[PDB]
Amino acid sequence: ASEVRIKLLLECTECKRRNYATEKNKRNTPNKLELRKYCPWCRKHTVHREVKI
Amino acid sequence: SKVCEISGKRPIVANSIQRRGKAKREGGVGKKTTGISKRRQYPNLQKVRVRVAGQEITFRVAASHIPKVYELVERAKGLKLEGLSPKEIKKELLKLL
Amino acid sequence: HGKRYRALLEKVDPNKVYTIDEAARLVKELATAKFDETVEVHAKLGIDPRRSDQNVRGTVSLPHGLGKAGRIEFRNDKTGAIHAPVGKASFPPEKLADNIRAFIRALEAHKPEGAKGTFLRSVYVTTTMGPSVRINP
RNA sequence: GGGGGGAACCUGGGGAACUGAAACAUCUCAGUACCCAGAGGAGAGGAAAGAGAAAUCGACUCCCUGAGUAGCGGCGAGCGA
RNA sequence: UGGUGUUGGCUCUUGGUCGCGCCUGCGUAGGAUAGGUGGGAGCCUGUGAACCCCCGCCUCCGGGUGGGGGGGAGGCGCCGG
RNA sequence: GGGCCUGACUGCGAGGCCUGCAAGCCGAGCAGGGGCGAAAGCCGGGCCUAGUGAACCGGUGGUCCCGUGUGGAAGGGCCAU
RNA sequence: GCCCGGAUAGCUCAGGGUAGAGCAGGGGAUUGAAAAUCCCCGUGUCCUUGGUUCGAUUCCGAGUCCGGGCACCA
Ligand SMILES: [Mg+2]
Ligand SMILES: [Mg+2]
Ligand SMILES: [Mg+2]
Ligand SMILES: [Mg+2]
Ligand SMILES: [Mg+2]
Ligand SMILES: [Mg+2]
Ligand SMILES: [Mg+2]
Ligand SMILES: [Mg+2]
Ligand SMILES: [Mg+2]
Ligand SMILES: [Mg+2]
Ligand SMILES: [Mg+2]
Ligand SMILES: [Mg+2]
Ligand SMILES: [Mg+2]
Ligand SMILES: [Mg+2]
Ligand SMILES: [Mg+2]
Ligand SMILES: [Mg+2]
Ligand SMILES: [Mg+2]
Ligand SMILES: [Mg+2]
Ligand SMILES: [Mg+2]
Ligand SMILES: [Mg+2]
Ligand SMILES: [Mg+2]
Ligand SMILES: [Mg+2]
Ligand SMILES: [Mg+2]
Ligand SMILES: [Mg+2]
Ligand SMILES: [Mg+2]
Ligand SMILES: [Mg+2]
Ligand SMILES: [Mg+2]
Ligand SMILES: [Mg+2]
Ligand SMILES: [Mg+2]
Ligand SMILES: [Mg+2]
Ligand SMILES: [Mg+2]
Ligand SMILES: [Mg+2]
Ligand SMILES: [Mg+2]
Ligand SMILES: [Mg+2]
Ligand SMILES: [Mg+2]
Ligand SMILES: [Mg+2]
Ligand SMILES: [Mg+2]
Ligand SMILES: [Mg+2]
Ligand SMILES: [Mg+2]
Ligand SMILES: [Mg+2]
Ligand SMILES: [Mg+2]
Ligand SMILES: [Mg+2]
Ligand SMILES: [Mg+2]
Ligand SMILES: [Zn+2]
Numbered sequence: 001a002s003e004v005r006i007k008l009l010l011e012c013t014e015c016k017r018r019n020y021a022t023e024k025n026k027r028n029t030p031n032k033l034e035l036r037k038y039c040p041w042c043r044k045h046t047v048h049r050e051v052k053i
Numbered sequence: 054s055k056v057c058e059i060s061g062k063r064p065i066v067a068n069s070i071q072r073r074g075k076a077k078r079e080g081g082v083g084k085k086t087t088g089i090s091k092r093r094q095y096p097n098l099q100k101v102r103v104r105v106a107g108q109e110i111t112f113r114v115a116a117s118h119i120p121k122v123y124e125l126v127e128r129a130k131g132l133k134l135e136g137l138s139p140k141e142i143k144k145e146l147l148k149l150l
Numbered sequence: 151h152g153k154r155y156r157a158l159l160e161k162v163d164p165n166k167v168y169t170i171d172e173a174a175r176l177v178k179e180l181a182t183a184k185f186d187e188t189v190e191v192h193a194k195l196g197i198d199p200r201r202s203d204q205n206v207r208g209t210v211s212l213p214h215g216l217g218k219a220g221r222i223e224f225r226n227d228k229t230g231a232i233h234a235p236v237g238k239a240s241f242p243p244e245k246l247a248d249n250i251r252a253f254i255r256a257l258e259a260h261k262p263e264g265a266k267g268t269f270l271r272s273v274y275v276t277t278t279m280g281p282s283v284r285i286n287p
Numbered sequence: 288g289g290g291g292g293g294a295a296c297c298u299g300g301g302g303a304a305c306u307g308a309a310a311c312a313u314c315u316c317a318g319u320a321c322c323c324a325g326a327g328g329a330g331a332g333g334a335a336a337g338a339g340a341a342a343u344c345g346a347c348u349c350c351c352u353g354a355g356u357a358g359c360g361g362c363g364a365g366c367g368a
Numbered sequence: 369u370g371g372u373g374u375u376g377g378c379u380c381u382u383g384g385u386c387g388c389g390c391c392u393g394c395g396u397a398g399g400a401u402a403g404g405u406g407g408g409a410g411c412c413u414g415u416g417a418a419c420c421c422c423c424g425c426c427u428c429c430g431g432g433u434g435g436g437g438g439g440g441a442g443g444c445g446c447c448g449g
Numbered sequence: 450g451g452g453c454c455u456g457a458c459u460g461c462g463a464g465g466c467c468u469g470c471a472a473g474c475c476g477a478g479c480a481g482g483g484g485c486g487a488a489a490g491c492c493g494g495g496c497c498u499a500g501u502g503a504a505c506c507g508g509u510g511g512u513c514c515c516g517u518g519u520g521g522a523a524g525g526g527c528c529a530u
Numbered sequence: 531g532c533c534c535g536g537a538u539a540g541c542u543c544a545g546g547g548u549a550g551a552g553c554a555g556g557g558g559a560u561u562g563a564a565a566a567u568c569c570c571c572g573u574g575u576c577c578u579u580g581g582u583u584c585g586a587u588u589c590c591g592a593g594u595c596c597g598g599g600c601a602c603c604a
Contacts, residue, residue, distance in 0.1 A: 007530090009510085009529085009530070011510085015511095016510090016511090017510075017511055017512095017529090018510055018511075018529065018530075019458095019459085019529085020457090020458085020529095021529080021530060022457065023457095035455055035457095036454085036455060036483080036484095037455070037458070037459095038456095038458050038459055038481085038482055038483070039459085039482095040458095040459045040460080040481090040482095041511090042482095043459085043481065043482065044481095044482060044483090045455095045458090045482060045483055051510090052509095053509090053530065066301080066302095074602075074603095075507095075601070075602055075603095077506095077507075079601095080507075080508060080509095080531080080602095081507070081508095081601095081602070081603095082506050082507045082508090082602075082603070082604060083506065083507070085313070085361080086312095086313050086314095087312080087313080088312085088313085089313080091302090097373060097374070098374095099373085099374045100374090101374095116373055116374050117373090119374080152411085152412065152413085152415085153413095153415050154411095156415080164388080183410085183411085184410080184411090185409085185410080187408095188407065188408075190406080190407060190408095192406085192407095198590090199404090200582070200589055200590060201581095201582085201589095201590065201591090202581065202582070202590090202591095203581095203591095224406080225405085225406085226405090227404055227405035227406065228403095228404040228405065228582095228583095229404060229405075231404090231405075231406080232406080233405080233406040233407065234406075234407090235406090235407070235408095276407090278407065278408060279408085279410095279411080
């Protein structure tokens with residue numbers, strides 16, 4: 001990473017649990033990430049939100 | 054500084070501990086001792102002068118036991134104390150502790 | 151202040167807190183003006199004035215009230231205060247405490263979700279031209 | 288009445304370093320060596336403002352066990368009920 | 369070098385802050401010194417109005433404001449521009 | 450180059466490469482819930498091989514496993530980072 | 531990591547009703563010149579967005595960036 005390529009987590013947006021960690025380049029991508037992603041807690045796919053690591 | 058004439062308190066030995074780091078309760082990695090060393094802690098010795106049977110009698114006393122000196126004078130009432138040199142009066146007073 | 155008011159002042163005493171019932175028995179003793187005075191209930195919400203979200207506003211349909219039926223609208227002012235008419239000096243005492251209490255209830259029902267302090271920092275009962283009495287809400 | 292002496296043993300007051308950590312500072316060596324005071328034939332301790340989970344035990348001391356357990360620890364070296 | 373003990377008496381000047389009393393708040397249109405709002409068609413006066421005199425005074429200089437001497441029947445609002 | 454999308458999955462993992470240890474690497478297949486495709490199928494990031502750092506100590510989010518007589522709490526474990 | 535903070539025109543700057551001030555630039559006066567002086571003029575979502583108020587750089591929330599402060603680093 002760097003200061004601009006940054007690490008982050010992905011919180012399931014139904015149960016609010018952080019299920020995945022990844023990285024983005026916050027210049028290239030100021031938008032907080034949204035990714036459908038499978039939540040083991042909910043056991044279904046779910047939209048997940050970028051949430052600070 | 055020596056010894057409480059009333060209470061017997063005398064200097065104890067203590068360590069001076071020197072720590073760094075941030076306490077764990079504060080989210081810190083923890084405290085680290087950077088030095089331990091012996092030092093002494095002294096009693097708060099002070100002088101208390103009193104007149105008793107017309108003689109001046111002074112005590113070396115822990116500040117904490119200053120009033121116990123006065124109690125002591127107060128109990129010196131029912132005492133035949135005349136003629137006495139200051140040394141032997143004091144003797145008589147601590148005989149009441 | 152006028153003799154008429156200076157009089158009433160005696161039947162009060164600031165220190166004392168009073169009770170919803172004790173205050174209801176005084177109201178009548180405090181309404182010495184030539185008309186059916188009201189009563190009013192002044193609070194003092196312990197929330198932040200300059201804001202929103204934590205703004206106290208709404209209505210209450212008092213079981214008796216007004217007599218001028220119910221549904222009074224109340225809204226906290228720029229300061230931390232909120233005021234409202236609870237009835238007219240007439241009303242049997244055991245009729246006001248029913249509204250004072252019914253109104254104060256609504257206030258609590260409209261407390262925010264993000265408010266610091268004891269909310270009802272203070273509460274008072276009064277009449278149009280009379281003095282006032284603190285109360286244990 | 289004290290005073291001084293006694294091989295070790297004992298209790299109190301004070302109290303190291305080499306060394307170990309394959310460097311070192313916390314830690315270890317160790318409350319050890321040693322210095323001092325005081326006992327005695329022993330000394331200390333001792334009749335619960337205790338233990339600590341059993342609606343339990345019943346002063347203190349000493350041995351065996353519990354146990355290298357429980358824990359303590361630059362969670363290292365080690366320490367240790 | 370700060371706090372605190374040993375450490376006491378008398379004054380004078382003060383700030384923080386709890387309470388209560390009480391005034392201070394002036395863009396522009398305007399009776400003119402508009403704090404925010406809710407209440408309120410009446411209330412201030414024999415517990416003495418209207419101006420008159422000393423003024424604690426505050427001021428954006430127009431005024432607000434408060435004790436008392438003169439004081440013995442009219443002032444201040446809904447109106448509504 | 451374009452369309453749809455988030456498999457830059459969760460739970461595992463036969464079997465190997467490499468190797469003093471610890472590591473490193475490749476992996477078919479099964480289950481869950483998906484994407485794209487008519488389908489056969491493909492997808493557990495990126496043509497490949499560098500872009501990294503054991504443990505200890507501590508942060509944060511979950512979990513609700515322990516909780517020093519009991520209920521709680523303090524603190525800790527476990528999953529994630 | 532947490533706490534205090536500044537952002538206003540080209541540079542520097544003070545500020546619930548508002549938008550200006552110093553010298554830089556330009557025009558004019560003056561001068562032998564360089565200045566100094568003097569008169570006019572510009573050069574603004576008052577960092578961003580969202581919210582109060584009738585409205586606001588002014589109050590508040592949220593952001594972004596530099597400024598400062600304290601602490602910690604297995
Ligand atoms: Mg990942
Ligand atoms: Mg990326
Ligand atoms: Mg997924
Ligand atoms: Mg799970
Ligand atoms: Mg110290
Ligand atoms: Mg430590
Ligand atoms: Mg004391
Ligand atoms: Mg001897
Ligand atoms: Mg001897
Ligand atoms: Mg000893
Ligand atoms: Mg010794
Ligand atoms: Mg020495
Ligand atoms: Mg050493
Ligand atoms: Mg050494
Ligand atoms: Mg060594
Ligand atoms: Mg060595
Ligand atoms: Mg060396
Ligand atoms: Mg030791
Ligand atoms: Mg024997
Ligand atoms: Mg014996
Ligand atoms: Mg004994
Ligand atoms: Mg006994
Ligand atoms: Mg050790
Ligand atoms: Mg030891
Ligand atoms: Mg000092
Ligand atoms: Mg002092
Ligand atoms: Mg494509
Ligand atoms: Mg294998
Ligand atoms: Mg191997
Ligand atoms: Mg599948
Ligand atoms: Mg499929
Ligand atoms: Mg399909
Ligand atoms: Mg298929
Ligand atoms: Mg596969
Ligand atoms: Mg270590
Ligand atoms: Mg840890
Ligand atoms: Mg449990
Ligand atoms: Mg439990
Ligand atoms: Mg307990
Ligand atoms: Mg318990
Ligand atoms: Mg309980
Ligand atoms: Mg917990
Ligand atoms: Mg936890
Ligand atoms: Zn979920």
